[PDB]
Design a protein around this nucleic acid. Sequence first.
DNA 1: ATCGGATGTATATATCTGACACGTGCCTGGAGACTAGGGAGTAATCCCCTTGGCGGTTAAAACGCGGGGGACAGCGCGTACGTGCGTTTAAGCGGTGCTAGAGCTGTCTACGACCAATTGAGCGGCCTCGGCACCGGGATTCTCGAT
DNA 2: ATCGAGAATCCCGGTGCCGAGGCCGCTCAATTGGTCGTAGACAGCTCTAGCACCGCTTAAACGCACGTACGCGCTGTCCCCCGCGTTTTAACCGCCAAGGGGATTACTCCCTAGTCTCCAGGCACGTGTCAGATATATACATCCGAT
Lengths: 99, 99, 108, 109, 148, 94, 93, 76, 85, 82, 83
Amino acid sequence: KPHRYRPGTVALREIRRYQKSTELLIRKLPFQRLVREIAQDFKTDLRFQSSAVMALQEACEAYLVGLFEDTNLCAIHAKRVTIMPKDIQLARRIRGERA
Amino acid sequence: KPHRYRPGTVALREIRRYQKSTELLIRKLPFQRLVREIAQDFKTDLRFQSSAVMALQEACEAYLVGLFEDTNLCAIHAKRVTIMPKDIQLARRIRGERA
Amino acid sequence: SAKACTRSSRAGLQFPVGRVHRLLRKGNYSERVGAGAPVYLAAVLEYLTAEILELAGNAARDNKKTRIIPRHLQLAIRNDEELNKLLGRVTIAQGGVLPNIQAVLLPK
Amino acid sequence: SAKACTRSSRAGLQFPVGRVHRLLRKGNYSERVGAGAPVYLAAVLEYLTAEILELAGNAARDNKKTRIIPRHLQLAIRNDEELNKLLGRVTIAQGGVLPNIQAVLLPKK
Amino acid sequence: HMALKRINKELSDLARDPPAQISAGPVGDDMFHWQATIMGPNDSPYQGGVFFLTIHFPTDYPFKPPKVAFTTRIYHPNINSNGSICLDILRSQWSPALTISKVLLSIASLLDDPNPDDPKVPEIARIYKTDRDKYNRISREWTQKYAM
Amino acid sequence: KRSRKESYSIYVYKVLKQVHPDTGISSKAMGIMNSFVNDIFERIAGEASRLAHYNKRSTITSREIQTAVRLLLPGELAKHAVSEGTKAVTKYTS
Amino acid sequence: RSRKESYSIYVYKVLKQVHPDTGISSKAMGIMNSFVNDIFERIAGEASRLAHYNKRSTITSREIQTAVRLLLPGELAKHAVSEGTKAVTKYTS
Amino acid sequence: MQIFVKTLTGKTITLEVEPSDTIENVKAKIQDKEGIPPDQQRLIFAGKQLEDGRTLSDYNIQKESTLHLVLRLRGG
Amino acid sequence: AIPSLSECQCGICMEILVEPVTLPCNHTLCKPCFQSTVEKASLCCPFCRRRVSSWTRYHTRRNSLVNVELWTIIQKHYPRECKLR
Amino acid sequence: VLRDNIQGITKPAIRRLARRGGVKRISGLIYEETRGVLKVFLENVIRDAVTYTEHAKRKTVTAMDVVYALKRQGRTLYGFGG
Amino acid sequence: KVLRDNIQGITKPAIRRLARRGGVKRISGLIYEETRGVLKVFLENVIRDAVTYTEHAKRKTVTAMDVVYALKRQGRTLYGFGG
DNA sequence: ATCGGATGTATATATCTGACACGTGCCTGGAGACTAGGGAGTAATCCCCTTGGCGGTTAAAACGCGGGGGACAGCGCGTACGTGCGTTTAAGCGGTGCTAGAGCTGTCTACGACCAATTGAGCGGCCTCGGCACCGGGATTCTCGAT
DNA sequence: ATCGAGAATCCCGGTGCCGAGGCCGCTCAATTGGTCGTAGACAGCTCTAGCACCGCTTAAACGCACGTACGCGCTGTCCCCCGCGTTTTAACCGCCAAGGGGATTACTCCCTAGTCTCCAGGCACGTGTCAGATATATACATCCGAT
Ligand SMILES: [Zn+2]
Ligand SMILES: [Zn+2]
């Protein structure tokens, strides 16, 4: 009885909204903790400038968005509308990032 | 009464033979004529060293081999065995050659 | 050109010719730098900057704004045929992406 | 060192040190070139050269020959992992490719 | 040549509609050479002084500005001792639609009010900025000693 | 006080005023434009240096810059940039 | 006539040092020349850039060390760094 | 042969002269028709200063030519 | 409706205009004037003085510089101007 | 000490990123693979950044090092200097 | 001395051989035209830079060194031809 | 699950030829000794900024459930492509001739590097007001269940 | 084909605040002048090889015929993401506080460019000879129709 949208018709709304704004899509503190963890793995007792963390976040955001766009293109090519891991492996294979 | 192989086997034999050798697979004279035609389109009255033509041929053959390998991988991803022009188009699109 | 005026104004440019000359000379590019190189380099740089700024301002006007922000810069760069080709691998910070939804995905 | 022999011999290397020093100085990389840099650079070049040469020699001995031809170098570079990453975007003239066929394409048993 | 007809139009327009306080023409048989005289505006300290200058027209015209230089001396920050002049119309923003009459009118407007942005002679510029009377009577002295 | 730092901010602002008479620009866009100018200049200068070394010469003449511009940029931008550079150098000479 | 410079006899010496029995053909030899030139140019360019990074003016040993560490992958980087350090230590005395 | 000349005050006056008239004759006629002393008068045609020694025909002057007058005030 | 001969002349040449080119500011010019002011002038419309470099580059690639309607009107109703040159 | 932080990239974040990329329907195994590839990317960039910091005898990896590591990898970044 | 439609010199068996070398079993009937177009684009993109290099040096003959330099600039280094 | 043809591929042996490994003349770059000064190492100081912590509040994350659309397997069709054979075409190899242009050498002149005095263009710091962020109310427009 | 209720999105008006644009003081790098060693522009010469042509094989390309297996549409099943509501958690903001190391300056010293002289290591050219390519004749693995 309550109004419920057809399945999928609100995903298009999210796509339209998120392709218009430019704010960061990943929370700050978890990303900072992950970056500090990896750096501590490489070298112990390291300090990070906040600008460096923001730049790393921007680069990761752009890389992930591009990879997902290519993966969706592959999924469409496969006569489907959903992305599954083999699409990501194929996309990373054609781009020459793994070989 | 005549003996003919099943369709596909001698294709595999050809694949096994041509991945073993290292010669050039495009006839030299037509390729040289094509190169000279392109050059005369760009700048009139040019002369070509033989080594330049050979280097161009090697580069073109390597690029085409790589493209065909990636195209076959893309087509196999689609639960098919053949290769079709849309496979080439997608393999070129992902690499960013045309975008 | 007539002398007794700054080098940037002799050629009609606006970018700093002397600064470009110093950067070329002290940047470990070549042992000797000609006297015509910095003028040409400054001309090319200024032309490219003006070309990108025109499109950025046009997009900003289309968005009912009077201050160019990085989003307008990305919209201007990526919607141009040649500039996108030149800046193929460059990521503009806080630039977002172009609006694009695949044809198949739309409802029928 | 002894400070009596040739510079390459004094360093205990085989690749040249004077030629690399000249190339660094005249190549317009920096105004000054340190006295120890060419030794390091020659050592690294010689190590990488020896690595590739050893792989090529093993590949050639596998194929029952006595000379490394371009195909042997191509095989040695591709079969190894690290050297393939170091030369990922290169193309070897008269090189060929590794022999491989996708599993789907093989005939049904 | 194509520029010849455009110069014919310029000379015809100048003849049919002579300007006020500026008069210009070809001093010699050669058409490319040109010369002009400008009289100081009434609302200026250049009363009673006439300024003569020469112009060289490039063989490629109207898309390239001609060279203009005073032969007389005057007290003005933009005007150099040898007659060198700095104006954006002259070299920076010269346009095909611009006319010699328009640049002469711009020169007259410059004479009405000196430009303090990028003067060619800056010492007399800060002298004028220090006080108006000093520039006034030095300009009067110059225009009554040489320009007259 | 802090050491003096160099930037292209004022020239970019002058060009912006020349193109759009009544359009402002934020600081982030200034940073982006400055980085873009630095990147393009470094690309062109490095290409010219390599080209001038490839002919066993020693001086970076305007011809090297013109050829580097013809190399790096796409076709139409290359043609326009070459025209602009030729015009600028011709005006500068005389 | 104007003579050409190449790393030929040096690569041949290295090959004879590693494989005493085998030889090397001409085309593979030119390939090896090109490879050595490529690696040299990459390492030197990275070192020169990094030297300019820190407002220096000279290329010392540690500059080449950091360039080698940056360019080559892990195991190759470690082995090459060890080899270079050993060579420079042998050279300094 | 009728011509026109404009002064600094923006007034145009008519002169009936002949092309062979000397410049000094022209200045005498201007003084007669206006009362202005000759020494305060300077004559310019298309930027060319007129000297009393020569004549009008030396400048290739045609009919209904418009001239400019400059007042040379002795003192300022 | 049909433009007169007096207004058909070039805005710069002071003569007949051939192969019209229309700018974003709706200014018509002949190809000689346009090309010469592109390649040895400030690269802007001489009448309004605003940059047209982006439009020029856009329309040169696909050869969209000329305006068909005005050119064909001038050619059909004023042919002997074209016969002159 | 820091441990088990890759889960900080929660499922809604990855869903939002795919939505920006132009993704309508997401499967259930995408998230783990995305986390893995992201970890690979961070490791590969941070290695170069920390090496650049090491070479300068410094102890804080300022944004300049990150920018230059990205430039070396072929992923030039604007807006942070350079 | 103009030349016409020399791309027809790229025979169907040649492209078939190239695909076989790449590891392709079954080929459709339309790959040949697309491959011909791709080859044209590649030759134009390389020859443009090669001719620019050989023109900047006041020469009338392209040389293998010019081609390898153009390829290295474009992003596909080639060994075995000097430089 | 073989079994026999029949095919292609692998393997052993003679041979001969041109490219590789080495020997030699020599000359041009590399090595050795000495000098000057500036670039870099080192110690000391300052203060900016990075790390660390606490409390609130709340938007964002986690969990559960109903279901409808999409992934995926199976069947049938026919059409496009593999495979083999005969025929036509131009690639490939040798041999010769010619010269346009690549490459090297000698002159010398004009373009660019170096150094000193100087001053105005460009940068650091302050301040202000307007363009943009934000909130509340209303008008507009896709969307879906129901006809 | 449609009508309508509920929900998301766009316009408009008012209020506020902080950062971008302009102004001032200042110091240092661009400017101008003059001098001087040399890079390359030009003319001239040599001689390499790139182009053009001709003739003879024969290997590769072409056109055609036939058959089959693979692409594609269609159907059915089922199951797994999606959309929504409710509850928990920790991100974010503002606040304070401490000291670590980045950034700067002054000092000194020793490492390297620059010059001159001298000489031997590598390059060009020439020559001998055997590794590999070729032809020929057997041996064996593999495929396909048929039991
Ligand atoms: Zn015209
Ligand atoms: Zn206009």
